[PDB]
């Protein structure tokens, strides 16, 4: 039932937040089902692998020919007004790429926005057994 829609990059903000032009309007998107280490919040400080996660997402979306957004089957925005989506760069899901590299954990799993949960958890398990980055 999920469908991909085109969007255009405005700016990568950090590892799991990107600003896109979607249907003619600028919008902040927060990646579904993942959490990258913080780089901004004073309470957290700059967490280890935060800069690495931000650089990974930035490189992936800036070099892409085509960006697409895929909403899940529940709420499409969070309480901060951010879009909640799976984001694809040239057909590759950014959310999964981060988890597979050990630069994000699977997190914030809120039903019914969990269609790709199993897929992402399998990638997380592989990153853990390979002891990559956050799992090292
Ligand atoms: C990924 C995601 C985050 N959020 C909210 C939960 C957290 O709220 P609180 O700020 O109150 O803790 C926050 C985590 O986002 P960030 O990781 O960007 O900080 O965004 C959702 O409500 N739904 C979601 O699907
Ligand atoms: Ca985060």
From Swiss-Prot:
Disordered as annotated region, ranges: 116-136
UniProt subcellular location: Secreted
Active site: 30, 38, 82
Composition skew (Basic and acidic residues), residue ranges: 116-132
Entry binding sites for Ca(2+): 16, 35-36
Stated name of the protein: Nuclease A
Domain of life: Bacteria
Organism: Staphylococcus aureus
Gene name in the database record: nuc
